[PDB]
Amino acid sequence: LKRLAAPHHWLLDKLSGCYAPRPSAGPHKLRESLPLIVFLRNRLKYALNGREVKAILMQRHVKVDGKVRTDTTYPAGFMDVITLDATNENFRLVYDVKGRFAVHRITDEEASYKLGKVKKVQLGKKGVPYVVTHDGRTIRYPDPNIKVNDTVKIDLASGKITDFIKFDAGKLVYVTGGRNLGRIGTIVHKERHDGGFDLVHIKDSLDNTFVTRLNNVFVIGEQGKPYISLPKGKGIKLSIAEERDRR
Amino acid sequence: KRYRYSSFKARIDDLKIEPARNLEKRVHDYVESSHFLASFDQWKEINLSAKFTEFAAEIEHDVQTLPQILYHDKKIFNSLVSFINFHDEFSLQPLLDLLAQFCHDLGPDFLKFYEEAIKTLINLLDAAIEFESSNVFEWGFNCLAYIFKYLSKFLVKKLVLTCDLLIPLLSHSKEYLSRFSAEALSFLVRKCPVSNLREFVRSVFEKLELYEGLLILFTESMTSTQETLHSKAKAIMSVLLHEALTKSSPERSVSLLSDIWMNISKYASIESLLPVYEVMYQDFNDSRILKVLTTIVFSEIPDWNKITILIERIMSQSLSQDKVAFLFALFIRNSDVKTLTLFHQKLFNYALTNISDCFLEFFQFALRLSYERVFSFFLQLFLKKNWQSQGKKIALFFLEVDDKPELQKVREVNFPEEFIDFFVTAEINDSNDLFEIAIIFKYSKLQNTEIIIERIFSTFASPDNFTKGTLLKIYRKEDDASLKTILDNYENYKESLGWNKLVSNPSESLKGLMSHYPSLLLSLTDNFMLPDGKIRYTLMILQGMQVPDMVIEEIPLTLQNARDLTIRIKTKTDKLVSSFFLKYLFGLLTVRFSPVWTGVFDTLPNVYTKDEALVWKLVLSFIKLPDENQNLDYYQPLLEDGANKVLWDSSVVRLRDTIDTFSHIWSKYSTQNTSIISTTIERRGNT
Amino acid sequence: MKLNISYPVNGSQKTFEIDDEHRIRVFFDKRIGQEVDGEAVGDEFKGYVFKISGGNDKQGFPGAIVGPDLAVLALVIVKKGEQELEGLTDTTVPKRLGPKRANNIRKFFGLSKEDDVRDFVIRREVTKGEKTYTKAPKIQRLVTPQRLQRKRHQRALKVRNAQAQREAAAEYAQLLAKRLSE
Amino acid sequence: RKKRKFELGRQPANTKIGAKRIHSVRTRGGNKKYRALRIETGNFSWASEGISKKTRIAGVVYHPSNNELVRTNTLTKAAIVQIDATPFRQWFEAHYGQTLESSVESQFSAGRLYACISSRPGQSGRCDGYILEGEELAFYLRRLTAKK
RNA sequence: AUACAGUGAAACUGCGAAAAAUCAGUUAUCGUUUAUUUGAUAGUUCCUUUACUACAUGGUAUAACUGUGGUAA
RNA sequence: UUGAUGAUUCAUAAUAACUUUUCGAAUCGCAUGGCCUUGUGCUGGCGAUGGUUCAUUCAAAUUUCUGCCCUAUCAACUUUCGAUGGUAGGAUAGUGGCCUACCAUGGUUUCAACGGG
């Protein structure tokens, strides 16, 4: 029960007692996930207090990416969907221009699937090739052109793969983690060191050639035709001073 | 402690519609002069389903201003029908509530859509059967009953049409759909007047041949009021039901009306029956009314019941009648009517079966009419009374010998004129009835034993022996001739009723070695016969008789240990009897404490006192054994049925029908008199 | 000396009170479970086999050599003889609870495994004063219709999982075939 | 789970031959180990033809870290033991048809061979050895000359 | 409701109570554990089986309980 | 004709055995459905627990290097009872003198080792 220094992109109120919620074991890490208490209590405000959040979790109203997951401290981290059956809602939680967990209202035909970066492709047991992804869905029998640091498109009815975005020089990219969060565009340079500290450089509307760690990046799709929608003008971070200079 | 997590069946069984008893619901009577706009704009703010919001986006220009409701009547109903038959589970409360307030707001112009609405929601209720969520048909049956509550003024003639539309909800072979449709139809029965009601029930009685239980639920919820009373429509609903009955109806109509009378009499049972039974008796005075009389008298007014039964008996004289007389004798509290009913049932037939059913129900009194029934004119009733209980046999001892004594002497003459398997069965059918009729019968029984010299005929000779110093010489003759438990009971009766010892004594140790069979009752009777024979011609024998005649398990373990200790501390008859009763205790196979105590105390005394032979006999008794006593002819059954499917009236009808099937016919009575069986040839696979 | 003696065959016990300090001498230097003679220790019963287990002194304490403070001595009856003492051998106590398992009630009533027992259960009776109440315990480890349905579902679950897995393996085989062909 | 201390150890298993006993010991984090104590039998395998057999071990004749372990007959890893040679001889006769390498055909009629322990039966739970053959046989024949 | 059925004392069970010295970071675990959560995960236990078999499912060994006491608590 | 790693004796498959033995469901609440060989016959759902292995997750564990006061009228310290390395073993969840044998005699330091508050 160690707390009061949470990941400060959760933005919980500081005069809200003393502690802060401990995300349990789950598909994502500690300081890059967001549990449903912080979601439904001080991020969109559907329930006032945490035991009422436990009531709406226990009453089967919420399902993260297909099944219910009746748990308060469930670390449903990045890129998954939350299909609130009542309110007709499909919260995909994605990132923003500033570092927070922006929300969407996804259509049902896009909320029927999710995607994610792989972490390794291995041979598991009895000579069966299986891949993993970033949220622990170790799924069997891929197409064996799946490479490391690539994205598959999980079907979310079954755990099958419908398509994959074989990343190379020049297919549209997202970022996650680091001080260059929430940016798009993949076409300047493709650096490859020996031991990390490398990026596929970024090109945007203002063509900002940017880099970060290769662990801090993953793909979406084709340039101009993305697989996921993106919030508030497909986040760019031009400048707030230029925004207040123009409009 | 809350959040019980009821099951689906728990929700449904605890669910009941009653929309008047749906107490407050002030969501639509606060009308903003349009009432559909009121319910609609409430539901648009409380519920957000996706297709309900798209339904509102298709409809929203065409909801306000009730004249613009009445002009655009077709498009809003076609949109509501399209989205109801779309039927997402989450968008079913607003659509059904809007349909209910829609019919409320139209009224007489709804009738063009009334025959589409019900079948669309019927498809919805079948989809809800598939969906398995009790909220769905809670909303569905509530909206259906609101449609009934708002169109009851105009559903006067078309009750037959709405039942033709609501057949697949009354009869669906699911249980709860029947009750949920039936109580809404019951509210519609608490309505439109008596002539339309009686022609409606006369037109719906044709559908009897789960419709019976569905109509039972409908009529029961119609007549039943809120709590501990009957409704105001009961004093005319019973009249309409009874006047649509009485031979202008189908076959099971009397059974359905009897089940309705039983359910209403079980429900109300305090004071509102005083307004129903008056009209019921006044309508039942016009004349099967015995089914209604049995239903009226089974559930625990007596003077009017006596007058109606007198009129029924006179109209009958100028079975079910036996069952009605049995129920009246079991339930009434009138001495004059009971003493007249004894002679009335004596004028009626099957008095022996009626006395058997009455003794099975309540052995009250008045065993002096069966004597006149026997003098008018048998086997199986006197046989069951003889093998019956203590007070039953003590009351049957009066009219045992007090039968037709001319017929008893005729049976004695026909038994003295001996013929002698089937002839022995005829002798047993004479013998069990003539056993209650001395030296002449004893010599005739000795002649029959010599002529027959199967085991049922041996038990029949034993029955004649129980019917019996000339008797002591006859018992010596039967000893010279010497089921088996009945034979040992006959030997006990003979020893209860010198030179015989000089003749016989052999037999003592033979009966001792025979008292090790597969029946503790046969062992007790054989030890009784051996004790009586050793008396008339000992301490360990009487102690073993006492100890063989969970606390009982521990006491019997200690007692068998004590008797084995006494026999270990200490004639050849006593030794053989102790070894055979110890083998009987080790092969009783019905109490593990005694079956452990015998096998734990037997290996202390001497061996080879027929011990290895008895152990080989136990290890070889599982070789080959069966039984085939006798047979008879065959006859018919399955009559006298006033009810089929209800509460415990069905169980009472099954018991009286099984008794009438036992004492039913000649071949059935012969087979049932053969069915009196002796002790068991059993206890395999553990010895 | 207080002697609580238990007759376990009849499940009872009683306290006798003994003199004979030179029989206390015999009770001295005895291991747990040695031969102690009934007539030798007692003028009130004759010729048994007694085996000690332990004793409590003052304040009630649990080597094997006992001491002089042993006021309470516990004895068990091993080999009974004949004497009907009114505290050990005469008093019959009932078994408090009967069997509960299915084959346990089959052994307790000798029941011939085709019986489908379900009626030989040991009832117990109570009554509040006007309404009777008979109570039957339970029969677990009994073949109800539910358990073999569950076993059937387990077997069909394993077969169906293997069916889906050996379908997916063949699908990946055709996918590797077309990846070879391109 | 997994604290740290400063300086201590534990008592070894230092197993013998005769009256085979196996005592389990608690391991933090799975793989509950087994100390073999006085184990008298072992799994012994041919290197070249590749056939194992359980075989009564006769005795360790060489230890390369303490000579006293040969005196006390201690079965640790990497020792030189004699076993039986008869089931490997049986397989050799059965499936080669020779019915008898040179320096192992000379050891067959002597009766007992030399092998190397590869398990750690003080910690693992069983004893295995492979029969030395080749340059291992050369240096261990030189180690027999180092004995004599 | 003649196995029990919702109610529940007590008890068994399951789980959890673990002054380069300190450290603030940084690197690896291709040098270990990986409990809990999450995702995939397994047809093979008898066939010297017809004088054909525990699997429609077999065995103890005890709490709470009942009983005898000690004791000064 | 083969997966990944900067890197494998990796992952994994097969081979010949040994298994004091592993697991491969003797469990539980709800509904009771479809079939026809109407037999207590065949099948059947929702999901609670337990278990094999792998991945993820948190948690623990070492280990890398950058960083703190005053000191030479404080310059030698440590191999004893391993102080410093090698080789094999014991062990241990584990590398590693962490200990056990044999070999080598080292290591730290005046830039302040070692000691003093």
Which of 2.60.40.10, 3.40.440.10, 3.40.50.300, 3.10.290.10 would CATH assign to domain A1-109?
A: 3.10.290.10
Burial track A213-233 (b if 16+ CB lie within 10 A, e otherwise): ebebbbbbbeeeeebbebbee
The DSSP 8-state label assigned to residue A31 in this structure reads: T
Q: Are A135 and A116 a contacting pair, CB within 8 Å?
A: yes
Convert B603-639 to b/e letters by CB count within 10 Å (16 or more is b): eebeeeeeeeebeeeeeeeeeeeeeeebebeeeeeee
Nucleotide nearest C136, from its CA to each C1': E3
DSSP B112: G
Residue B445, CA distances (Å) to A105, B431, B496 in order: 103, 10, 18
Which of A121, A126, A131, A143 should we substitute to test contact with C (largest number of C Cβ atoms within 10 Å)? A143
Tell whether B439 is within 8 A of chain A (Cβ): no
Q: How far is C138 from chain B (nearest CA, A)?
A: 17
Return the residue in B563, B590, B682 with the most chain C beta carbons within 10 A, the one to mutate for interface testing.
B590
Distance CA C43, CA D139 (A): 87
Third-level CATH fold of A114-164: OB fold (Dihydrolipoamide Acetyltransferase, E2P) (2.40.50)
Would you call B48 and A87 a contact, using CB atoms and an 8 Å cutoff?
yes
**Among residues B452, B443, B450, B453, which one has the least CA distance to residue B416?**
B443
CB proximity A5 to B under 8 Å: no
Q: Which residue is nearest to nucleotide F103 (CA to C1')?
A: D65
Residue with tokens 């038990």: B459
Instruction: In whole angstroms, give the CA distance from residue D52 to residue D126.
Output: 14
Q: Is C76 on the interface with B (CB under 8 A)?
A: no
Residues of chain B neighbouring C95 (CB-CB closer than 8 A) = 550-551, 553-554
Pairing of β A129-131 and β A121-123: antiparallel
Q: How far is CA B207 from CA A241, B23, B161, in A?
A: 83, 36, 14
Instruction: Determine the Cα angle at C140 with ends C138 and C142, to 5°.
Output: 115
Rounded distance, CA B100 to CA B19, Å?
Answer: 12
Phi/psi for B274 (5° steps) reads -70, -20
d(CA B580, CA B513): 6
Whole-angstrom CA distances from B451 to B443, B444, B459, C94 are 12, 10, 15, 54
> A-chain residues within 8 Å CB-CB of B53?
88
Nearest chain B residue to A89 by CA: give it: B50
Distinct helix (H) and strand (E) counts, chain A: 5, 11
Partners of chain B (3+ Cβ pairs below 8 A): A, C
Q: Residue D31, CA: closest nucleotide via C1'?
A: F93
Chain B residues with CB-CB distance to C92 below 8 A:
551, 554-555, 558
B460 φ, ψ (degrees, to nearest 5): -70, -40
The two three-digit tokens of residue B264, written as one number:
């209403």
User: Whose C1' is closest to the CA of C140: which nucleotide?
Assistant: E3
Q: Tell if A26 CB is < 7 Å from nucleic strand F.
A: yes
The answer to whether the beta carbon of residue A178 comes closer than 7 angstroms to any atom of strand F is no
Q: What is the structure's resolution, reported in angstroms to one decimal?
A: 6.0
> How far is C-alpha D147 from the chain's CA centre?
19
- List the subunits that have 3+ CB pairs under 8 angstroms with D: none
Nucleotide nearest A129 (Cα, C1'): F3
List the single residue in A with minimal CA-CA distance to B46.
A87
- Interface check for B48 against chain A (CB to CB < 8 A): the answer is yes
Whether the Cβ atoms of residue D118 and residue D77 lie closer than 8 Å to each other:
yes
C94 touches chain B (CB under 8 A): yes
Helix axis angle, B666-674 to B422-434, nearest 10°: 80
| Assigned CATH class of A167-237 | mainly beta
Which domains can be identified in chain C, with CATH numbers?
A: 1-94 (no CATH), 95-182 (1.20.5.2650)
Q: Per the structure block, which two tokens stand in for B583?
A: 């083998």
CB environment B422-444: b (16+ within 10 A), e (fewer): eebbebbbbbbbbbbbeeebbeb
* Domain ranges, ordered by start, for chain A: 1-109, 114-164, 167-237
Task: Report the neighbours of C using a cutoff of 3 or more CB pairs below 8 angstroms.
Answer: A, B
Angle (CA) C167 C172 C177, round 5°:
125
CB contact under 8 A, B686 and C109: no
How far apart are the C-alpha atoms of B200 and D131, rounded to whole Å? Answer: 102
Quote the CA–CA distance of D136 and D134 in Å, as a whole number.
5
Q: Are A154 and A173 in contact (CB under 8 A)?
A: no
Residues of A engaging C, defined by a Cβ cutoff of 8 Å: 128-129, 140-141, 143-145
* C113: Cα separation from own chain's centroid: 23
Nucleotides in F strand less than 7 A from protein CB: 3-6, 11-21, 25-32, 40, 43-45, 47, 53-62, 87-94, 98-101
Do chains A and D touch, with touching meaning 3 or more CB–CB pairs less than 8 Å apart?
Answer: no
Whether D106 CB is under 7 Å from strand F: no
Distance, Å, D37 CA → F106 C1': 39
Burial class for C152, CB neighbours closer than 10 Å (0-12, 13-18, 19+) = exposed
SS3 D132: coil
Nucleotide nearest to D15 in CA–C1' terms: F90
